[PDB]
Amino acid sequence: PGTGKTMLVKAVANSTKAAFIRVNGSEFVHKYLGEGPRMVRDVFRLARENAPSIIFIDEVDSIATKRFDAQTGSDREVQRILIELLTQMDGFDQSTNVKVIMATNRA
Amino acid sequence: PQLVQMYIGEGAKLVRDAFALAKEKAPTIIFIDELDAIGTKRFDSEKSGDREVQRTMLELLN
Amino acid sequence: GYDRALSIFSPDGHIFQVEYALEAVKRGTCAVGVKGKNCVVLGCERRSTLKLQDTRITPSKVSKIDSHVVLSFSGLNADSRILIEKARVEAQSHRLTLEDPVTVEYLTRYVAGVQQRYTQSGGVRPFGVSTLIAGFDPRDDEPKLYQTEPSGIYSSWSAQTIGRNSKTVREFLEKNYDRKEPPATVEECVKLTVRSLLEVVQTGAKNIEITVVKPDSDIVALSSEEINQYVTQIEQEKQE
Amino acid sequence: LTKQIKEIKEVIELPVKHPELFESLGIAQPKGVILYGPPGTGKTLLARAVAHHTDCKFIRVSGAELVQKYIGEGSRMVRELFVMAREHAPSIIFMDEIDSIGSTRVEGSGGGDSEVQRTMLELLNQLDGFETSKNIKIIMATNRLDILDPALLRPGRIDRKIEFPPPSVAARAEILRIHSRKMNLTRGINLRKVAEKMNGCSGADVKGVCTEAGMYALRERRIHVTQEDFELAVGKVMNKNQETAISVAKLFK
Amino acid sequence: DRGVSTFSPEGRLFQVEYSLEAIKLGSTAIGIATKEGVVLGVEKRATSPLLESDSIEKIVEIDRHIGCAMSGLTADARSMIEHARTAAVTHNLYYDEDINVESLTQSVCDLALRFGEGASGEERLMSRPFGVALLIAGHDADDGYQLFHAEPSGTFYRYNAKAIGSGSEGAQAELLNEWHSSLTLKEAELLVLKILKQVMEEKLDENNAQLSCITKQDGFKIYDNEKTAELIKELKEKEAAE
Amino acid sequence: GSRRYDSRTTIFSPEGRLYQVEYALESISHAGTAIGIMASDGIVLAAERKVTSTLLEQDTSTEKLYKLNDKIAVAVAGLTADAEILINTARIHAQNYLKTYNEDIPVEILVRRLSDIKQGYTQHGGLRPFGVSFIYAGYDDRYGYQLYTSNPSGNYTGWKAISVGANTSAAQTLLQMDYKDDMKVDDAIELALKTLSKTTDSSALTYDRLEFATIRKGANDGEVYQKIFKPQEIKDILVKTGIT
Amino acid sequence: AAPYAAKLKQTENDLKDIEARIKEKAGVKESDTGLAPSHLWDIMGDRQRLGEEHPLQVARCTKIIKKYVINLKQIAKFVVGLGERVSPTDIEEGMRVGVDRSKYNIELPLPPRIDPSVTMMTVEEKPDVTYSDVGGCKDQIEKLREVVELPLLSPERFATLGIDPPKGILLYGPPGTGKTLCARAVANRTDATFIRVIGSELVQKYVGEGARMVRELFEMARTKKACIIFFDEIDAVGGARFDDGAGGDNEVQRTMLELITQLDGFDPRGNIKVMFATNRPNTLDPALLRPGRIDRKVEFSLPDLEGRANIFRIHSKSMSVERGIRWELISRLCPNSTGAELRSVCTEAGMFAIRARRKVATEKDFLKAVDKVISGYKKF
Amino acid sequence: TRCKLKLLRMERIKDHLLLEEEFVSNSEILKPFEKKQEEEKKQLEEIRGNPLSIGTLEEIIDDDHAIVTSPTMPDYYVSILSFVDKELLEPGCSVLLHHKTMSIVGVLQDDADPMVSVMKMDKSPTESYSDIGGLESQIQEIKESVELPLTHPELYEEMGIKPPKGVILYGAPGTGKTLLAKAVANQTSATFLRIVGSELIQKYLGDGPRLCRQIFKVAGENAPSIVFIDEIDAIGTKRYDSNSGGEREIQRTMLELLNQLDGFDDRGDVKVIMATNKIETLDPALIRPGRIDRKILFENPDLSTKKKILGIHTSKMNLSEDVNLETLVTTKDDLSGADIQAMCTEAGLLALRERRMQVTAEDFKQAKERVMKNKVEENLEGLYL
């Protein structure tokens, strides 16, 4: 951060003249201990309605992890968000919405 | 929390009366006991009627 | 639990490491001893199903401790290498100091003493090998059969089996052998040990190894063709 | 790969269309099927493709059971998932749970995912009918066999397993060929060269080559590709795949 | 831990409690002392007919005038037996005097009355906590025939009759009143068999039980399996009349 | 089961199969492939290198191959760090024996003693097992050319041919399939190069990725001559076998 | 082959039609309860149905202001009055009232609260068990006699010593110790009433509804004389707090709290004994365990060898056994464990004998049953 | 085969005969409307305007009034008028009340809930006894606890021993545990209740404990019975975690069932089949013998067992008589009975790829390679060291 990733997308937001959906990783991680899987589905649907749309997810460094802990109940929703995102992306090809854009510290 | 009888609808209101009664007919020492059920230092602190008992606690002292 | 301690005596009275030793004996090869009036027959599995194995330099499971003292074993091959070495040294020690050739019975005790010692000394595992030590006493021509256990004790049986599928072998040993009378002839005795081993090997010339030890330093391992001859004769009976 | 197509055809199409033929000529009926092999092979695609032609109702069923709120929690209404699928024969329940998640719980036996899943698996034979005819195949998809949820690992009812390799150069030639035909054909017909020279690693890899070669014609403001472009496009796509994947290692061995 | 550095909240030591269980599960052993010899009987707990029963022994000649039966843990018992033999032989070399039974019980118990790894003005050779008791029987000139119950726990207790192991609660209850000092050596043998008969589920024969005595005259004398067998026959006979 | 206990060698797993030993397998297999083929007219040792950087000088490192003495050479796969103690002891032990009887060490001896230290660290001492596998290539006149492998556990088994470290299974399926029973020494080199090219990422099997040695009884007047081939003689023979 | 395929195909259709034909069978015939002479009742019933005095909407006085201020259960307040003539002294805070649908006047005062009726279903009266056939010779059995019987039978001695009468006992032991069994035995012998409360059953919650039930039940007890109130399984709900959790919960703190305060400080009691059944004291909130709630705690001690021969004998009497069978020998081989383990051993010994085709169980059978149970417990 | 044909002939003449009889028999002209019926009918229509809003009878006061709670938050002090006896009504009964004025017009309910119907699954067990290829010895442990008191009460009565309460099935899946469960069920012909334990895991307030009570009521009503609490461990030892609202529910449900399994005493007339994978490495929640009595561990199939299972399967196959059966089972190590089932299914699938309608002599020796290799990978046993 300081490489102005978000800044780039602020530029494109004006010029597109068309939807811009700016969301954060916070929204996705639990809000009822169950809200998280639902919340993945709604951003993709909402994009279709007001297409063209730019899907921008600011944080995903903490949603995407190689390993997980299923012993914490709250974590299970983190795991489920990651797996549904992979699935939806394959069904999201050949749409007017741009395929998911995300910003990270690291690849 | 003991004077909360059944629902926290009809009882949150009961408590606002109890506060009113207790201040009136001074001098008095009101002994309020265990505070643990309405303490709720947590973030999942109820915004229900449990807030109302608790707030009227701050009012008494102020 | 108490598997992390040896010093800790345990109110269960049973230290888990000791239990775990037994799991280890089971896994190993089946090794059997059956004794006549004039012989110990030791029938044992040696696996040889391994592809690209030069069989010549692969160690036979039976190892000469002494000139007339032999050992077969069930349980982990690595752990077993320590018993064989201590026991060999002590063999020659015996002669060096008593002059007397190896008393087998001393030797049974010496070996068990090591599996015992290590149960008391923390930071030393109990071995998960059970063995058969068999031999013939100084100035004697009566066969001698012993088993040791990882519980750090020893016992003598008229015939005994250890290792994988020992349950199966034990029924045979009850019905075809007797403490009261061992098969008087060497020949009888060898043929039954082949039939026992067949129950778990299920047909193999080199998978079955027979070493007969006689008195007075007579060690000879049966010829593959002769072993093959026991099998065919037995196999004719099976369909009758 | 078509290796794959014959192997999957036998398993799903014949018992769904006519259980009566399958049963008699063979013995028993096939159960669930587990697709394993790397990401980016296009396993999902296969599952969609069979359902298209058979006319199985591809119901994508999210691993989550909390995304279902409609008639209550989908954990508690396990039984409704069964009853309704049976009516809705022919059907493919694509129960996406990759099982990369829950690294701890593979070797464990705790966790909410383990609880719900094991009852679900038992329910199919207690209610009956999916036993009688496996017109509803429960397609699981995962990267490996060794990462499975502990309920599915042990015997139970999973039996059929189909292994997908990452493409060979032959298979790569096929995938590359057909996308190029739809798009703009590789001129000098050196799409065969490109596949012979090197292997990618996925069919996902191959669609990336397709996009880039075409983007190179766009920069010139041309609308047709040539061999020169594929030769640039391949080196860029494929090399990038290697530099992102190697960085994790320090200098061990 | 729960070692011996940990003092139990109880006022005990955890290892000491743990030692008792091993004696409880141990082999059933009976001793009844007279002033004409002490007779000890054990169950050799024969389990299979391929087991050689004779070979196995849980009554062992420790010294000329002393023998011991063992109850507790089979492992610990090796070490314990070697200690005892040595302790006796050292004194005989050193002063060339027959020792008391009392003197022997103490010395065996000398290694016993310390537990831990820590030592502070002493040596260590231990590495645990041992849990094995013995019946230590013998004869000394001074006080005649003596029977001791050597414990791996508190100070040794002298006994006139004692039974330990798994058959203990019954066996001991019988003993309090059946014991007397007026018994002959012949009366006393049959009385040991009697208790043994009751507390052993399987029927009594000479292939699973062995009798032995310490009388000064014949030293530690292991009964012939013929000598044992007849008295079993005698036992059944008097019970028929009775 | 759940609570995996393995702090010490002495402390048992419930399973009874010490996890520290299990982890040792993983490690061996981490390292690349090494392969010993014993032939009737020599032994051939051929392996793909661990290292892969061109900056790092692959050429001067024969990480896999060290000679312990004039007749005995060992190929090494596993933990480099741990390994370094054992290679060194083995040389001194060999020279200790030659001191005593003024004869070359028998192959069988030299393995059994080293295996026994490996056991020593589980038998007593918290000290980790030194998880390393060597393939020993040796000659003695007791049995001729002898090949051994050693398990981290501390046991050995002879072999007609064996593979260690990574992709043991694949190299093993190929060797047994085309195995020529007698085995000529020329043949073994050809056969080895074929197996490595299929398991090695470079399918052109560059020389700079190759370590090679041949120990030959086919050396004049019937004697045992160890020859470490340098990267420049590997390259010349690469063009002889035609993979490049 | 083929002509016999079509025999299967026919069979299936038939079986399905028979099952639907059941509905047709049931028919349309309607008949309702009230036989013999309660359909002649219905003829009276008809004119009174058209008649009006039923229903009465039920509400509850929340204050008497010399008219009355009533509060209905839908939550809505009215000032009302007396109907035919309803004395002032009858209507009290908490007293239910019958009022008319819409003319809103008191007819009958109705007994306070409908909540006792709900909870009186759970309540069970003076259970009976004979103390002699109570297994073991347990020390615990004796301390129960001190708590319960002796203050009821002879309150005089307690006054004289100038000790407080014991009234609280906390029962805890592994499952199968006989906590329920001994409490029922001393209920019978002392000849005192009994109130069954099960705390595991409390689920009626509105933030403190569980607290209403508990105050009423304990109060029911005070009214009663020579009684026992046995709250069963207070391991959870009025047992452990669920505050510890991330989101947490405190409907259980309401229930818990109420009970503590009824016990703690002045409050009359009509010789109320307090029995608490927890499987483990650990689960029990420490607040309750530490004193000034329950007076006494006894850790159940597993039956002695004499007590274990004693339970076995109880079972052996029920059984048909061999003559000269050694009860004591069987018992000694057996672990020091609950009366439960011993119940099971007699159960399996019975069965192996039946299988073996015997009507009298041998000594040998119980050697087998023992070997079975040891292994079970161990392996887990 | 043939035995089955003999039965078809009888079953198809029974149905036909019944169906025809039924018209007349039910009525179609019989039309009872004589004085006793007519009475009931006339009255019932008059009194009952509909809809009828049900209540629960909380208490009786003897003066033919009752106090009931209706579904409305106001309760109603009602008259008892007409029909149902005063005696017959006991508190806790659910009741029909008339909508114009609330009066007790009868009962026909008995606290009927849809939950009981769902649970109720007496329906045709798919298993008969010994269709299964399992071993006589395993099934004749379940049978000993469950069957044997119902078939022969003489021996149990005479001994004086109590009839056993419960068994626990645990294995090892692919030992056909639920097959075993429905083998037992067929023989007894008992009301066979089934409930799955995950329906008792919910965030919903207090619902778990309510469900637990229902189960004991249901079994007792429909006694003699077998209650299959399938995946008992779902409630118990098995988890759904407590950072998901589980810090409330799971505790309350576990305790509740536990408390009712002991009860004031073991019922001793409700048999249970408790399923769980194994409680060896899991915590035990099935609280000691005498309430679960004999506990049944199914062996992993040995060589002789799988012979019997194998014989079923080979019957349909043609060209497996030349194939030596004995050698296929031996060569494979001892493994699940499921793996022999898997093999048969794969075998047919594989014949089709060769293009042979049913298995070739060769196909069967080949079949073994694909199934053994797949299964050993799936489940890896400790390697001998």
Ligand SMILES: Nc1ncnc2c1ncn2[C@@H]1O[C@H](COP(=O)(O)OP(=O)(O)OP(=O)(O)O)[C@@H](O)[C@H]1O
């Ligand atoms: N063979 C193919 N032909 C066409 N496109 C392909 C092919 N394979 C993969 N792709 C492309 O790659 C995208 C992503 O691959 P997909 O998610 O279907 O992979 P998968 O191997 O089933 O993985 P996961 O591990 O996520 O379950 C597809 O949506 C498609 O556009």
Ligand SMILES: Nc1ncnc2c1ncn2[C@@H]1O[C@H](COP(=O)(O)OP(=O)(O)OP(=O)(O)O)[C@@H](O)[C@H]1O
């Ligand atoms: N004792 C047994 N009783 C019944 N079938 C058995 C037995 N042992 C082995 N099996 C074999 O295992 C096959 C499959 O059992 P199935 O997998 O349905 O059983 P389960 O143990 O109830 O498990 P799950 O529900 O987890 O699949 C049976 O059809 C049969 O071939």
Ligand SMILES: Nc1ncnc2c1ncn2[C@@H]1O[C@H](COP(=O)(O)OP(=O)(O)OP(=O)(O)O)[C@@H](O)[C@H]1O
């Ligand atoms: N004193 C005893 N004599 C004989 N059997 C006994 C004795 N005590 C309990 N049991 C047996 O133990 C079992 C359960 O007894 P009880 O119902 O009193 O248990 P508890 O300790 O109160 O358990 P829970 O934890 O389930 O509330 C029964 O099988 C009973 O016969």
Ligand SMILES: Nc1ncnc2c1ncn2[C@@H]1O[C@H](COP(=O)(O)OP(=O)(O)O)[C@@H](O)[C@H]1O
């Ligand atoms: N093109 C640029 N000109 C000026 N400053 C820049 C430029 N790009 C990035 N920055 C700096 O980078 C910082 C971060 O920008 P921002 O869009 O908030 O994103 P992030 O921290 O997520 O990359 C700002 O302080 C901004 O000044």
Ligand SMILES: [Mg+2]
């Ligand atoms: Mg940012």
Ligand SMILES: [Mg+2]
């Ligand atoms: Mg996919």
Ligand SMILES: [Mg+2]
């Ligand atoms: Mg109880």
Ligand SMILES: [Mg+2]
């Ligand atoms: Mg099942």
